Ligand binder design. Structure first.
Ligand SMILES: Nc1ncnc2c1ncn2[C@@H]1O[C@H](COP(=O)(O)OP(=O)(O)O)[C@@H](O)[C@H]1O
Ligand SMILES: [Mg+2]
Length: 212
């Protein structure tokens, strides 16, 4: 049910950093939940700012939140928001490149001293690609506020050297991120553990989180 399927390569620096991050941040692997929930919260803020000049962007779905769900059989964790969403060009510009400034130096500054690592991670957002610390496949389904449902976007990657993008019909506004968990990462199928991790981060993040 996809149209315009295209494979694109990660930029070289991005590819190398992704690979380094999976190792260097493993002792703080739960940080991906901070990163994805933070992104949902920003997406909600963006929707609200845009909606100032166009109330219809709420689409009658005004209660903004992020929903977390689990599939034990498929070994997936899904983080889904009804924030601003992304167009195809936004997906390519933001999830394609995504060479976050300072990331290289940040990762190189991590090491065996867990106290220094915790201090660093507390001060720097690694972003979306943190998902690959715990997941061997990440799939995004998104549809931007005000856009026709037929102009949704699919994005998928194994976090190696490429991703695939396509057009999809997505009736609901926002971004749904599905993580297929790596072997050994069943921690993130435990609703209590995930709720607990998120609650600690939710002290600084301003968007309601619903754990299914
Ligand atoms: N849930 C989402 N909804 C809308 N846009 C998103 C979402 N997640 C990520 N993005 C987009 O991808 C970009 C990159 O995210 P990220 O790697 O976390 O870096 P940052 O949050 O610092 O910009 C964001 O700036 C945003 O434009
Ligand atoms: Mg972010």
């Amino acid at each position: 049910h996809m149209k315009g399927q295209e494979t694109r390569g990660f930029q070289s620096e991005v590819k190398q950093l992704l690979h380094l991050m999976i190792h260097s941040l493993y002792s703080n692997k739960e940080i991906f939940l901070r990163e994805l929930i933070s992104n949902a919260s920003d997406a909600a803020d963006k929707l609200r700012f845009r909606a100032l000049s166009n109330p219809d962007l709420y689409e009658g779905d005004g209660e903004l939140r992020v929903r977390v769900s689990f599939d034990k059989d498929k070994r997936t964790l899904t983080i889904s928001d009804n924030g601003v969403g992304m167009t195809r060009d936004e997906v390519i510009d933001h999830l394609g490149t995504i060479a976050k400034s300072g990331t290289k130096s940040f990762l190189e500054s991590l090491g065996s001293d867990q106290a220094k690592d915790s201090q660093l991670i507390g001060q720097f957002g690694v972003g979306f690609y943190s998902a690959f610390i715990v997941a061997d496949k990440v799939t995004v389904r998104t549809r931007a506020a005000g856009e026709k449902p037929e102009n949704g976007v699919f994005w998928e990657s194994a976090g190696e050297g490429e991703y695939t993008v396509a057009d999809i019909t997505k009736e609901d506004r926002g971004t749904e991120i599905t993580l297929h968990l790596r072997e050994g990462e069943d921690e993130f199928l435990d609703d209590w553990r995930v709720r607990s991790i998120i609650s600690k981060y939710s002290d600084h993040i301003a968007l309601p989180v619903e754990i299914e």
